[PDB]
Ligand binder design. Structure first.
Ligand SMILES: Nc1ncnc2c1ncn2[C@@H]1O[C@H](COP(=O)(O)O[C@H]2[C@@H](O)[C@H](n3cnc4c(N)ncnc43)O[C@@H]2C[C@@H](N)CC[C@H](N)C(=O)O)[C@@H](O)[C@H]1O
Ligand SMILES: Nc1ncnc2c1ncn2[C@@H]1O[C@H](COP(=O)(O)O[C@H]2[C@@H](O)[C@H](n3cnc4c(N)ncnc43)O[C@@H]2C[C@@H](N)CC[C@H](N)C(=O)O)[C@@H](O)[C@H]1O
Ligand SMILES: Nc1ncnc2c1ncn2[C@@H]1O[C@H](COP(=O)(O)O[C@H]2[C@@H](O)[C@H](n3cnc4c(N)ncnc43)O[C@@H]2C[C@@H](N)CC[C@H](N)C(=O)O)[C@@H](O)[C@H]1O
Lengths: 125, 123, 123
């Protein structure tokens, strides 16, 4: 029910120019639907299912590098390696990286960040 | 130098509370947290504040997830040394509140994580 | 090799800025951060980008919290080794910007945290 493990965080753009969504709820459904498909497909391959909590956001960077004024519409995906389901943390990590790259490809993103953070998970069921 | 932060993820249980918007879910969960944190504070003098964020959680539809994700909330907070004198008792308190939130939101499962953090508090 | 991420939590000060939606607050804080980060970059060549999320912060009404929570914003960012040559200088830049944000948002207190993180950057 408790133990040291890893969480991940990925930040992606929503690519309005390609998908033409017009609200943050539409953007969340877009990214969430892609994550759902790729996570299920990898689960069928490796028996490792990576669930993700997805949050709306704006990412602020220099307008001279392409950022809209007041920020780019983005989505933050996070998840934790639950030892109830993950027997091998290194395989899970490699799965997350694989999914992050697939998300970057299918979202047509030029760059993407994927972070791993040490966490102590308490799981109540 | 280092302290802890927590992160809890819960469903919002629209079917039970009959809320109709993510804004209503935030007020619902906020009010529940506000009440349970106050109640615990009056027992132990340990107040656990929480930053609450809207979210969706994506998992396998075979396990009950709606297409594109379940509506969820993320609650986070930090053990501020200004207010916290015993980190172990603070962790116990977060866990106690996380279990109360799980019960009141009628959740079958719930995650509560602790992450090491370096807090700079400006006042 | 780990790097750092930061997390800042701030009020949105609806009463001072006369905003009436979370979207308006997000754009306002986003513009304020964009300006202070650009000005700092023009001096030090350290650009601190930030991912900003809407939120509500729940604390004791006895200390001034509104019922169900205060409207807040969470700003996070990562020290990407592709652009950050000196982590200490980056950390001091984040702290400097957090203090500027506190002043410009007219906040009485503000938290700024640093968390160790393993960053994979795909380009
Ligand atoms: N900090 C920096 N210092 C110096 N130059 C920079 C910096 N950032 C960007 N640049 C320039 O811009 C070019 C593109 O860089 P990049 O796409 O990485 O620049 C990114 C970061 O500045 C920021 N960002 C991304 N993930 C973040 C996270 N987890 N936390 C905080 N901020 C985040 O967001 C920027 C744009 C991304 N959101 C991607 C935008 C778009 N969807 C795309 O795919 O191209 C670089 O090659 C540089 O020339
Ligand atoms: N990763 C997995 N691998 C294998 N089987 C799984 C997995 N996840 C769920 N299952 C199956 O589904 C059953 C239910 O498991 P569980 O309720 O824990 O499955 C949860 C996780 O997959 C995901 N989730 C929850 N917290 C998360 C976090 N912090 N980060 C990332 N994802 C998070 O969300 C799922 C459902 C929860 N949101 C709760 C749903 C609902 N409100 C409820 O109370 O039952 C399990 O007994 C398994 O049979
Ligand atoms: N935990 C506590 N225990 C005991 N006394 C407390 C506590 N918190 C606040 N107080 C009392 O209230 C006064 C003000 O304290 P403070 O402004 O720090 O109290 C803050 C925290 O309780 C909470 N908060 C802020 N950042 C947070 C984070 N990252 N995670 C979780 N919660 C967060 O939010 C409270 C108010 C802030 N959002 C600022 C509100 C307002 N915008 C302002 O600028 O004054 C203190 O001097 C004490 O008298």
């Amino acid at each position: 029910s408790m133990g040291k493990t890893l969480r991940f965080e990925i930040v992606s753009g929503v690519n309005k120019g390609y998908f033409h969504t017009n609200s943050q709820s539409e953007s969340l459904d877009l990214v969430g639907g892609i994550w759902q498909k790729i996570a299920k497909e990898e689960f069928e391959k490796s028996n490792i299912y990576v669930s993700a909590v997805i949050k709306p956001s704006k990412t602020v960077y220099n307008q001279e590098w392409g950022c809209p004024e007041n920020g780019e519409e983005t989505v933050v995906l996070t998840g934790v390696a639950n030892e109830e389901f993950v027997d091998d943390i290194e395989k899970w990590k490699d799965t997350v990286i694989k999914l992050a790259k697939e998300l970057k490809n299918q979202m047509k993103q030029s760059t993407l960040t994927c972070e791993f953070i040490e966490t102590e998970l308490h799981y109540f069921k």
